[PDB]
Amino acid sequence: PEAFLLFSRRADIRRISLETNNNNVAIPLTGVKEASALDFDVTDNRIYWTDISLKTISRAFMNGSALEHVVEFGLDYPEGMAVDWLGKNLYWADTGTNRIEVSKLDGQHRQVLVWKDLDSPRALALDPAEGFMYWTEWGGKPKIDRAAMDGSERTTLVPNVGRANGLTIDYAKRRLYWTDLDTNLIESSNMLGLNREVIADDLPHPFGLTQYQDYIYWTDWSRRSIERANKTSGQNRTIIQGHLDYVMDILVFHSSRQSGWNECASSNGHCSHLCLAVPVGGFVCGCPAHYSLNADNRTCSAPTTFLLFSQKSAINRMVIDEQQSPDIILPIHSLRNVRAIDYDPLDKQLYWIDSRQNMIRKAQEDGSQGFTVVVEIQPYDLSIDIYSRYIYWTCEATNVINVTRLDGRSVGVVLKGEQDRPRAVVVNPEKGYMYFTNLQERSPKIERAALDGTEREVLFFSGLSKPIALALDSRLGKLFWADSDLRRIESSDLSGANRIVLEDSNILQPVGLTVFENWLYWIDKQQQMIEKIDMTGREGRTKVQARIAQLSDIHAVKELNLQEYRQHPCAQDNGGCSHICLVKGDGTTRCSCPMHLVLLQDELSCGGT
Ligand SMILES: *[C@@H]1O[C@H](CO)[C@@H](O[C@@H]2O[C@H](CO)[C@@H](O)[C@H](O)[C@H]2NC(C)=O)[C@H](O)[C@H]1NC(C)=O
Ligand SMILES: *[C@@H]1O[C@H](CO)[C@@H](O[C@@H]2O[C@H](CO)[C@@H](O)[C@H](O)[C@H]2NC(C)=O)[C@H](O)[C@H]1NC(C)=O
Ligand SMILES: *[C@@H]1O[C@H](CO)[C@@H](O)[C@H](O)[C@H]1NC(C)=O
Ligand SMILES: *[C@@H]1O[C@H](CO)[C@@H](O)[C@H](O)[C@H]1NC(C)=O
Ligand SMILES: [Ca+2]
Ligand SMILES: [Ca+2]
Ligand SMILES: [Ca+2]
Ligand SMILES: [Cl-]
Ligand SMILES: [Cl-]
Ligand SMILES: [Cl-]
């Protein structure tokens, strides 16, 4: 097989033949803005690249076909990237997010492997046959680190270096090569970071490096060239190609650079998701972010409970766990201005309002199955009745509470009055009630009504100025709200009894709130904070996360007890009801209708007028 050298420069990935240096061509890719890190896969001759301007990681065949973005969310500066050709994983280092991550080569099952005490990780190199990965860190005190390829047993391998790049392993000879931008040289060590030897010096900015057979190849920005030298002696130096300024990466493309074996074998180690190499020649089964590995050490389980929080253009998920796993961005396309979110735990689908396009949309957490539920309306807030399978939502333009089935079929309006201004809304189908803020002129109110709009009552009319967020927790039997003018968070029993102020200090702009276990979580848009308060009163107010821009909503997802769920009388085929099914205070469950219809004598069906 003829070996080739690939390199990135500007928006191009170019190929040079190491047998005939004159032959230089561009790989036929479209849509590239800035080609950065490069790699390939020996199995199928796909090329992989990062684009630090577009914030993506992509792949394609060398003929340009099957071009796809395998990572396109939650990146900032993906400067390091490598293919694990044995486990069939993609690894990357993001200098902006300070994370080292992994996924399958097609982008599935993304997981964060390193995220704590990480300062500008840059050049990544993998040794899947041995089960170790290596990377450089710039930032405060530059160093080269090593970890197992599942992220475990992280150590500093080389503590005394300048800003290092082009980290490359000679797998045949068991040596690690890198460039040093500050000491102005290329050097190598053994795999333990010992027996260091300078190969070439007087290189003001050796930015890229690779190795093939007896030669190293590098590019120095001051020389504007790609050069080659003997890897051991540093002699026999020649120019491969000149007049190449600011080359970002170089890669020897040849099958001998992706050899060896490991115990993942041809079966992904029988791991359900990720097969991650660990020393020596072995593996562990890995899981997507927030999943847990089952007792069998092979299969993964999705998180049973988590918190969602939205920004203007992102929906994020976080978990509370012993590892303190990091928050992730959900890969949901076409977000523009997310105003409010909800989640259906039965079908595992995220719902949101987008205020740019005035729509209610849904998708799976992995981004698939995107669908428009409601589309001059102006949705403000939404709340899912997970038993009856419909969404209650407020319209800021017509000032109604409308009800729409999850599949988009309208049920109809349950609240409308000439002076009514329904805004925040939350349903409690366990008891048959909905709760809403009513921002009536000169008299804001918190109200409730049965889920068909009957039995309307004002719970609170005093001590309200701009109640902007509303939440409830059926287990605690409590209602919660936040006022952005009085700058406080309050609570009461769901009946309206026992109103209390939870917090009235250091609140600026409390735009959402949610209950997770015994904690009330809220988001403050101005302070850019998620914070929590302990409802048992034992622990103090605690900061959860800071510096989150454009916060819009927060939503806790409890674990769904499927047996309890199916015991809800509206859970089986909407209790036989054509429109609304609801629990009543007298202990019965009944069918009812939106405002334009009446219940017929069968007590199941609604008819006109
Ligand atoms: C581009 O290159 C790829 C990889 O060499 C080609 O993919 C093959 O396509 C054929 C028929 O379409 C299949 O039988 C093979 O299974 C594919 N191979 C792999 C590794 O995926 C693709 O055909 C090429 N495209 C062009 C236009 O030449
Ligand atoms: C409540 O929302 C539904 C959408 O879920 C609205 O239904 C639309 O009504 C318009 C005319 O008013 C029709 O052109 C559309 O075809 C309807 N869409 C669907 C999916 O049925 C309904 O108008 C809303 N009701 C109120 C009172 O605002
Ligand atoms: C590289 O240098 C080493 C040490 O001097 C020598 O043994 C080897 O033959 C050289 N290889 C090439 C390809 O020049
Ligand atoms: C799973 O691995 C753990 C150690 O991580 C070990 O104690 C246990 O025996 C393993 N269980 C199975 C079923 O392989
Ligand atoms: Ca590289
Ligand atoms: Ca320098
Ligand atoms: Ca809500
Ligand atoms: Cl050292
Ligand atoms: Cl009151
Ligand atoms: Cl809530």
XYZ file of C-alpha atoms and ligand atoms in Angstrom:
699
model
C 0.000 0.000 0.000
C 1.226 3.475 -0.969
C 1.516 5.785 2.066
C 0.183 9.345 1.854
C 0.546 12.438 4.003
C -2.656 14.347 4.778
C -2.611 17.910 6.090
C -5.070 20.630 7.054
C -4.724 24.254 6.015
C -7.414 26.926 5.795
C -10.646 25.181 4.721
C -8.864 22.304 2.928
C -7.650 18.820 3.685
C -4.891 17.992 1.214
C -3.062 14.771 0.301
C 0.630 14.393 -0.609
C 2.145 11.139 -1.858
C 5.268 10.073 0.062
C 6.355 8.082 -3.032
C 6.042 11.132 -5.357
C 5.981 14.511 -3.557
C 4.762 16.508 -6.602
C 1.303 14.893 -6.388
C -0.708 17.146 -4.026
C -4.557 17.206 -4.156
C -7.572 18.325 -2.081
C -9.875 15.706 -0.532
C -13.301 16.473 -2.158
C -15.198 17.774 0.888
C -17.963 20.404 1.052
C -18.991 22.827 3.796
C -15.621 22.951 5.595
C -14.841 26.342 7.179
C -11.616 25.550 9.060
C -9.996 22.116 8.840
C -8.229 21.384 12.128
C -7.459 17.913 13.579
C -7.361 14.915 11.205
C -7.484 11.143 11.395
C -8.643 8.101 9.433
C -10.102 4.617 9.904
C -8.234 1.668 8.397
C -11.335 -0.557 8.180
C -13.255 1.599 5.636
C -10.899 4.391 4.447
C -12.988 7.155 5.971
C -11.348 10.446 6.875
C -12.264 12.217 10.135
C -11.734 15.895 10.869
C -12.566 18.585 13.368
C -13.614 22.096 12.356
C -12.921 24.634 15.095
C -14.883 27.433 13.398
C -18.011 25.304 12.787
C -17.579 23.502 16.156
C -18.017 20.067 14.584
C -16.378 16.713 14.040
C -17.099 15.116 10.681
C -16.304 12.117 8.541
C -16.524 11.101 4.914
C -15.060 8.644 2.480
C -11.934 9.896 0.661
C -14.090 10.339 -2.453
C -16.176 12.872 -0.506
C -19.304 10.695 -0.280
C -21.259 9.971 2.898
C -20.230 13.306 4.432
C -21.692 13.534 7.930
C -21.261 15.428 11.180
C -20.773 12.820 13.870
C -20.406 15.452 16.611
C -22.122 18.813 16.121
C -23.295 19.936 19.587
C -21.492 20.925 22.780
C -18.108 21.586 21.217
C -16.067 24.788 21.428
C -12.454 24.100 20.352
C -12.081 20.443 19.369
C -8.347 20.685 18.648
C -7.472 17.092 19.541
C -9.053 14.066 17.913
C -8.142 10.444 17.287
C -9.698 7.287 15.937
C -9.607 4.085 18.035
C -9.454 1.597 15.154
C -9.709 -1.475 17.440
C -12.707 -0.555 19.627
C -14.212 1.522 16.778
C -14.431 4.675 18.881
C -13.846 8.343 18.193
C -11.949 10.310 20.832
C -11.532 14.055 21.135
C -10.186 16.824 23.361
C -11.944 20.158 23.591
C -9.727 23.030 24.679
C -12.761 25.282 25.237
C -14.897 22.936 27.339
C -11.883 21.269 29.038
C -13.190 17.785 28.270
C -11.866 14.590 26.769
C -14.749 12.637 25.276
C -15.495 9.457 23.376
C -18.219 8.094 21.126
C -18.709 5.410 18.517
C -17.213 6.334 15.156
C -20.685 7.333 13.902
C -21.155 9.651 16.925
C -23.480 7.385 18.934
C -23.197 6.847 22.703
C -21.166 9.957 23.472
C -19.495 9.943 26.900
C -17.170 12.277 28.807
C -14.021 10.519 30.074
C -12.018 13.389 31.615
C -13.471 16.688 32.838
C -11.960 17.562 36.260
C -8.659 19.406 36.752
C -8.196 19.700 32.984
C -6.655 22.910 31.557
C -6.577 23.233 27.755
C -6.075 19.642 26.559
C -4.761 19.780 22.973
C -3.035 16.931 21.088
C -4.444 13.412 21.681
C -2.771 10.076 20.855
C -4.238 6.591 21.382
C -2.647 3.236 21.974
C -5.692 0.902 22.029
C -3.490 -2.237 21.848
C -2.038 -1.262 25.257
C -5.131 0.533 26.598
C -3.570 3.975 27.226
C -4.225 7.430 25.803
C -1.946 10.451 25.955
C -2.511 14.168 25.580
C -0.784 17.491 25.948
C -2.027 20.313 28.117
C -1.084 23.929 27.640
C -2.564 26.561 29.995
C -0.867 27.317 33.319
C 1.728 24.567 33.778
C 2.116 22.629 30.515
C 2.430 18.852 30.724
C 1.732 15.588 28.960
C -0.819 13.320 30.635
C -1.655 9.623 30.327
C -4.827 7.739 31.188
C -6.424 4.390 30.471
C -8.727 4.699 27.463
C -11.778 4.607 29.739
C -10.430 7.746 31.470
C -9.265 5.874 34.587
C -5.816 6.077 36.245
C -5.021 9.547 34.941
C -1.467 10.694 35.682
C 1.029 13.278 34.532
C 3.464 11.415 32.282
C 5.804 14.300 31.397
C 5.751 17.268 33.814
C 8.624 19.330 32.348
C 7.627 20.562 28.881
C 6.556 23.725 27.088
C 3.376 23.903 25.014
C 3.505 20.562 23.206
C 1.771 19.479 20.008
C 1.700 16.683 17.410
C 1.842 13.922 19.987
C 2.653 10.741 18.025
C 3.379 7.165 19.033
C 5.826 4.906 17.231
C 3.945 1.687 17.987
C 6.668 -0.586 16.594
C 9.478 0.985 18.672
C 7.460 2.015 21.778
C 8.393 5.700 21.690
C 6.346 8.877 22.126
C 7.125 11.923 19.944
C 6.030 15.547 20.379
C 6.826 19.104 19.368
C 7.581 21.869 21.852
C 6.549 25.338 20.740
C 8.463 27.066 23.560
C 11.721 25.098 23.716
C 11.677 25.096 19.864
C 12.256 21.429 19.193
C 10.953 17.960 18.495
C 11.741 15.251 20.994
C 10.915 11.713 21.910
C 10.711 9.581 25.024
C 9.925 6.002 25.943
C 6.300 5.270 26.866
C 6.904 6.221 30.519
C 8.066 9.737 29.588
C 11.682 8.829 30.411
C 14.845 8.582 28.266
C 14.014 11.859 26.514
C 15.980 12.713 23.375
C 15.934 15.842 21.199
C 15.560 14.880 17.507
C 15.518 18.351 15.918
C 16.038 21.799 17.436
C 16.052 25.451 16.273
C 12.410 25.093 15.169
C 10.628 28.287 16.309
C 7.098 26.858 15.995
C 6.858 23.147 15.105
C 3.067 22.873 15.105
C 2.428 19.444 13.593
C 4.212 16.113 13.676
C 3.768 12.561 12.519
C 5.908 9.468 12.016
C 6.171 6.720 9.419
C 8.774 3.952 9.287
C 12.252 5.522 9.787
C 11.085 9.138 9.387
C 9.347 11.893 11.302
C 7.425 14.557 9.401
C 6.709 18.024 10.766
C 5.497 21.479 9.865
C 6.985 24.638 11.349
C 5.048 27.883 10.864
C 8.214 30.000 10.583
C 9.487 27.838 7.696
C 6.052 27.488 6.020
C 6.865 23.947 4.968
C 6.406 20.279 5.613
C 9.733 18.566 6.328
C 11.039 15.070 6.930
C 13.969 13.779 9.003
C 15.380 10.491 10.264
C 13.377 9.727 13.454
C 16.376 8.474 15.475
C 19.317 10.568 14.231
C 17.422 13.671 13.060
C 19.612 13.666 9.925
C 18.691 13.195 6.244
C 16.464 16.265 6.513
C 14.507 17.240 3.389
C 11.614 19.489 2.402
C 8.488 17.604 1.316
C 6.530 20.699 0.274
C 7.166 24.423 0.774
C 5.057 27.593 0.673
C 2.522 26.096 3.110
C 1.755 28.644 5.825
C -0.156 27.775 9.009
C -0.638 24.043 8.484
C -2.863 22.885 11.361
C -2.313 19.107 11.366
C -0.454 16.359 9.524
C -1.237 12.657 9.333
C 0.494 9.711 7.678
C -2.263 7.731 6.013
C -1.255 4.036 5.850
C -2.590 0.730 7.239
C 0.660 0.009 9.134
C -0.122 3.004 11.400
C -3.327 1.221 12.551
C -2.209 -2.310 13.339
C -2.279 -4.537 16.411
C -5.127 -6.176 18.249
C -7.019 -6.080 21.538
C -9.596 -8.118 23.447
C -12.567 -6.122 22.113
C -12.064 -8.567 19.178
C -14.747 -8.532 16.441
C -17.665 -8.352 18.903
C -17.211 -4.974 20.649
C -16.100 -7.014 23.701
C -19.790 -8.008 23.910
C -20.403 -4.536 25.327
C -23.858 -3.112 24.635
C -22.504 0.389 23.963
C -18.794 1.320 24.209
C -15.824 -1.062 24.300
C -13.058 0.986 25.937
C -9.477 -0.299 26.055
C -7.667 -0.510 29.406
C -4.219 -1.921 30.254
C -2.902 -4.341 29.181
C -4.647 -5.263 25.912
C -7.954 -5.515 27.803
C -11.176 -3.518 27.918
C -14.093 -2.331 30.006
C -17.622 -1.774 28.770
C -18.535 1.903 28.792
C -21.840 3.731 28.654
C -23.235 6.909 27.176
C -23.157 10.015 29.396
C -25.409 9.567 32.472
C -26.049 5.870 31.797
C -24.970 3.313 34.406
C -23.211 -0.012 33.776
C -25.313 -2.972 34.930
C -24.152 -5.750 37.296
C -23.202 -7.943 34.291
C -20.480 -5.352 33.400
C -21.655 -5.479 29.750
C -25.034 -3.717 29.366
C -26.000 -0.084 30.134
C -29.096 1.522 31.651
C -30.435 5.025 30.967
C -30.637 7.470 33.891
C -33.833 6.927 35.912
C -33.972 10.543 37.096
C -32.381 13.777 35.944
C -32.815 17.510 35.551
C -33.297 19.339 32.274
C -32.517 23.011 31.849
C -32.892 25.135 28.770
C -31.126 28.159 27.416
C -32.248 30.266 24.453
C -30.580 27.867 21.983
C -29.865 24.722 23.998
C -31.475 22.082 26.152
C -29.194 20.516 28.749
C -29.382 17.476 31.016
C -27.719 16.999 34.406
C -27.728 14.204 36.975
C -27.012 14.092 40.706
C -24.476 11.306 41.293
C -21.384 10.319 43.298
C -19.014 10.826 40.331
C -20.427 14.349 39.878
C -20.895 13.547 36.173
C -20.874 16.656 33.984
C -23.901 18.263 32.346
C -24.423 17.538 28.646
C -26.154 19.383 25.815
C -28.887 17.368 24.089
C -28.256 17.083 20.323
C -31.587 18.586 19.281
C -31.605 20.338 15.915
C -33.224 23.674 15.025
C -33.465 25.288 18.483
C -33.791 29.085 18.183
C -35.508 30.578 21.233
C -36.544 27.971 23.801
C -38.953 29.570 26.266
C -40.182 26.523 28.190
C -39.671 22.753 28.379
C -41.426 19.575 29.519
C -40.743 15.844 29.207
C -42.870 12.751 28.631
C -41.340 9.923 30.688
C -43.481 7.229 29.005
C -42.180 7.662 25.435
C -38.999 9.470 26.575
C -39.566 12.615 24.525
C -38.617 16.216 25.169
C -41.189 18.951 24.479
C -40.532 22.675 24.228
C -41.893 26.032 23.136
C -39.871 27.937 20.583
C -40.832 31.618 20.708
C -39.050 32.547 17.461
C -41.303 30.257 15.412
C -44.229 30.197 17.909
C -44.419 26.392 17.940
C -44.509 23.507 20.338
C -42.082 20.811 19.207
C -40.861 17.473 20.493
C -37.935 15.108 19.942
C -36.124 12.185 21.575
C -33.185 13.020 23.885
C -30.746 11.796 21.208
C -32.326 14.223 18.699
C -34.215 11.679 16.565
C -37.998 11.662 15.937
C -38.349 15.491 15.860
C -42.000 16.557 15.475
C -44.183 19.691 15.582
C -47.106 19.422 18.021
C -48.620 22.920 17.725
C -47.967 25.452 14.926
C -51.525 33.934 15.093
C -50.798 31.796 18.172
C -48.073 32.631 20.696
C -47.420 29.752 23.121
C -46.120 30.897 26.501
C -45.929 27.843 28.787
C -46.808 24.155 28.430
C -47.600 21.251 30.761
C -48.025 17.585 29.849
C -50.693 15.355 31.309
C -48.690 12.116 30.956
C -51.682 9.886 31.768
C -54.329 11.284 29.405
C -51.646 11.986 26.747
C -52.180 15.681 26.021
C -50.464 19.012 26.576
C -51.960 22.034 28.281
C -50.556 25.273 26.926
C -51.162 28.999 27.323
C -51.430 31.346 24.362
C -50.163 34.900 24.933
C -51.986 36.244 21.840
C -55.523 34.928 22.423
C -55.184 34.470 26.225
C -56.551 30.943 26.431
C -55.490 27.653 27.916
C -55.645 25.163 25.054
C -55.283 21.380 25.085
C -53.615 19.401 22.320
C -52.949 15.672 22.074
C -49.290 14.616 21.914
C -49.806 13.624 18.254
C -50.985 17.175 17.389
C -54.770 16.586 17.366
C -56.479 19.492 19.145
C -58.676 18.675 22.134
C -59.753 22.319 22.526
C -59.878 25.283 24.900
C -60.539 24.803 28.633
C -60.097 28.430 29.779
C -60.970 31.742 28.195
C -62.369 34.946 29.712
C -62.262 38.451 28.251
C -59.986 39.750 31.057
C -58.069 36.478 31.663
C -54.332 36.435 30.951
C -53.217 32.842 31.596
C -49.428 32.492 31.547
C -47.511 29.897 33.606
C -49.368 26.585 33.776
C -48.775 23.233 35.476
C -51.068 20.192 35.616
C -51.561 17.731 38.459
C -53.527 14.852 36.922
C -53.009 12.735 40.053
C -55.653 15.030 41.638
C -57.469 16.396 38.529
C -56.306 20.034 38.770
C -54.402 22.560 36.710
C -52.645 25.561 38.249
C -51.849 28.793 36.465
C -50.775 32.373 36.873
C -53.243 34.934 35.630
C -51.486 38.211 34.884
C -54.645 40.291 34.945
C -54.240 44.022 34.721
C -53.554 45.445 38.207
C -54.316 42.102 39.895
C -51.995 39.180 39.169
C -53.354 35.926 40.528
C -52.443 32.311 41.087
C -55.450 30.134 40.304
C -56.479 26.543 39.917
C -59.252 24.756 38.092
C -60.270 21.187 37.291
C -58.545 19.870 34.187
C -61.669 20.638 32.091
C -61.679 24.302 33.219
C -64.535 23.946 35.726
C -64.265 24.565 39.483
C -62.121 27.659 38.869
C -60.775 29.275 42.027
C -58.301 31.991 42.957
C -55.713 30.626 45.365
C -53.696 33.833 45.762
C -54.305 37.473 44.814
C -52.068 39.366 47.299
C -48.261 39.583 47.590
C -47.941 39.068 43.824
C -46.452 41.501 41.306
C -44.867 39.489 38.493
C -45.238 35.757 39.217
C -43.148 34.460 36.328
C -42.583 30.765 37.121
C -44.762 28.022 38.583
C -44.017 24.442 39.660
C -45.576 21.696 41.732
C -44.688 18.403 43.291
C -47.446 15.847 43.733
C -45.506 13.852 46.381
C -44.877 16.933 48.562
C -48.406 18.203 47.794
C -46.872 21.656 47.200
C -47.123 24.512 44.709
C -44.131 26.826 44.087
C -43.757 30.139 42.296
C -41.242 32.911 41.746
C -41.916 36.626 41.472
C -39.450 38.673 39.390
C -40.603 42.027 40.784
C -40.911 41.086 44.458
C -37.746 39.008 43.885
C -38.742 35.993 45.894
C -39.724 32.369 45.793
C -42.828 31.162 47.597
C -44.626 27.925 48.295
C -47.975 26.690 49.537
C -49.954 23.517 49.856
C -51.784 22.655 46.628
C -55.037 23.718 48.340
C -53.651 27.241 48.867
C -53.059 26.628 52.578
C -49.840 27.413 54.428
C -48.330 29.991 52.097
C -44.685 30.618 52.961
C -41.742 32.565 51.621
C -38.876 30.187 50.821
C -36.327 32.812 49.779
C -36.411 36.611 49.434
C -32.688 37.502 49.271
C -30.216 37.407 46.363
C -32.935 36.777 43.784
C -32.823 38.888 40.615
C -34.575 37.143 37.709
C -36.020 33.701 38.715
C -37.409 32.436 35.394
C -37.944 28.768 36.231
C -38.153 26.336 39.091
C -38.585 22.618 39.686
C -38.608 20.057 42.487
C -36.063 17.257 42.547
C -36.550 14.962 45.534
C -36.457 17.255 48.611
C -34.758 20.161 46.792
C -36.358 23.150 45.093
C -34.132 24.072 42.144
C -34.397 27.398 40.354
C -32.667 29.356 37.629
C -31.796 33.030 37.723
C -31.280 34.488 34.232
C -29.511 37.652 35.400
C -27.222 35.872 37.860
C -26.688 33.044 35.310
C -27.121 30.499 38.103
C -28.846 27.271 38.936
C -29.418 27.139 42.712
C -31.248 24.873 45.138
C -32.988 25.058 48.508
C -33.608 22.084 50.822
C -37.343 21.699 51.591
C -36.598 19.635 54.739
C -34.756 22.696 56.124
C -31.602 20.804 57.136
C -29.099 22.045 54.538
C -28.522 25.610 53.359
C -29.203 27.253 50.016
C -26.632 25.798 47.608
C -25.171 26.948 44.272
C -25.436 24.190 41.645
C -23.857 25.761 38.530
C -22.725 29.263 37.496
C -22.009 31.224 34.302
C -24.908 29.744 32.279
C -26.048 32.335 29.726
C -29.649 32.895 28.571
C -31.335 30.473 31.006
C -35.042 29.978 30.195
C -36.455 26.931 32.061
C -35.646 24.018 34.364
C -37.480 20.743 34.742
C -36.910 17.730 36.980
C -37.748 14.283 35.625
C -38.689 11.741 38.306
C -38.379 7.972 37.792
C -41.575 6.550 36.296
C -43.073 3.711 38.346
C -44.724 1.845 35.465
C -47.066 -0.151 37.782
C -48.276 2.998 39.542
C -48.601 4.747 36.182
C -50.895 2.050 34.730
C -53.089 2.270 37.871
C -54.013 5.855 36.958
C -57.611 5.642 35.649
C -56.892 7.837 32.587
C -53.726 5.906 31.609
C -55.557 3.183 29.653
C -56.987 4.703 26.456
C -57.825 8.014 28.166
C -60.311 6.120 30.377
C -62.497 5.600 27.292
C -63.057 9.378 27.004
C -63.182 11.129 23.615
C -61.679 14.348 24.967
C -60.749 15.025 28.602
C -60.354 12.339 31.269
C -59.886 13.575 34.828
C -59.804 12.529 38.476
C -62.473 14.199 40.651
C -62.411 15.188 44.307
C -65.287 12.827 45.117
C -62.961 9.919 44.210
C -64.458 9.191 40.799
C -62.794 9.569 37.419
C -64.874 11.240 34.720
C -64.862 12.216 31.074
C -65.364 15.844 30.226
C -65.108 18.269 27.362
C -63.451 21.496 26.226
C -65.599 24.632 26.323
C -67.276 24.360 22.890
C -68.735 20.864 23.538
C -70.975 19.015 26.016
C -70.676 15.493 27.466
C -73.166 13.111 25.829
C -75.310 10.594 27.726
C -72.767 7.749 27.339
C -70.554 9.824 29.701
C -67.588 9.162 27.363
C -68.209 11.248 24.234
C -68.497 14.984 23.614
C -70.887 16.531 21.073
C -71.199 20.021 19.581
C -72.895 23.058 21.165
C -16.351 6.052 -2.060
O -15.540 5.150 -1.347
C -16.268 4.243 -0.549
C -15.251 3.422 0.239
O -14.253 2.918 -0.621
C -17.203 3.386 -1.412
O -18.019 2.628 -0.551
C -18.344 1.329 -1.086
O -19.500 1.356 -1.899
C -19.787 0.115 -2.520
C -20.967 0.274 -3.483
O -21.565 1.544 -3.343
C -20.062 -0.959 -1.462
O -20.141 -2.227 -2.078
C -18.972 -1.007 -0.393
O -19.428 -1.748 0.715
C -18.573 0.384 0.087
N -17.374 0.291 0.905
C -17.272 0.819 2.126
C -15.955 0.616 2.821
O -18.177 1.448 2.680
C -18.088 4.258 -2.307
O -18.714 3.471 -3.297
C -17.234 5.288 -3.028
N -17.996 6.246 -3.814
C -17.655 6.553 -5.072
C -18.533 7.582 -5.738
O -16.687 6.044 -5.667
C -56.156 25.521 20.086
O -55.071 24.986 19.351
C -55.401 24.264 18.188
C -54.128 23.604 17.663
O -53.766 22.513 18.489
C -56.047 25.196 17.164
O -56.515 24.422 16.073
C -56.361 25.048 14.780
O -57.426 25.929 14.477
C -57.288 26.612 13.241
C -58.463 27.566 13.044
O -58.794 28.206 14.256
C -57.217 25.622 12.078
O -56.900 26.303 10.884
C -56.175 24.538 12.324
O -56.333 23.517 11.364
C -56.316 23.948 13.724
N -55.237 23.000 13.963
C -55.432 21.767 14.443
C -54.200 20.927 14.614
O -56.536 21.305 14.748
C -57.222 25.933 17.800
O -57.636 26.988 16.962
C -56.887 26.508 19.177
N -58.111 26.998 19.796
C -58.227 28.226 20.309
C -59.564 28.568 20.899
O -57.318 29.058 20.328
C 18.471 6.685 10.278
O 19.532 6.811 11.208
C 19.929 5.621 11.860
C 20.984 5.968 12.909
O 22.048 6.669 12.302
C 20.466 4.628 10.835
O 20.776 3.408 11.471
C 19.417 4.380 9.760
O 19.979 3.625 8.710
C 18.874 5.688 9.194
N 17.758 5.398 8.311
C 17.536 6.080 7.190
C 16.343 5.652 6.385
O 18.243 7.013 6.808
C -17.988 -6.975 37.376
O -16.773 -6.333 37.715
C -16.593 -6.174 39.108
C -15.371 -5.300 39.377
O -15.483 -4.094 38.655
C -16.425 -7.548 39.744
O -16.298 -7.414 41.145
C -17.621 -8.438 39.418
O -17.330 -9.770 39.781
C -17.981 -8.402 37.934
N -19.266 -9.060 37.741
C -19.560 -9.780 36.658
C -20.930 -10.395 36.620
O -18.784 -9.952 35.718
Ca -3.337 15.395 14.777
Ca 8.804 29.157 19.791
Ca -43.252 23.804 33.762
Cl 10.263 15.393 32.696
Cl -53.868 36.072 48.662
Cl -43.416 21.442 37.902
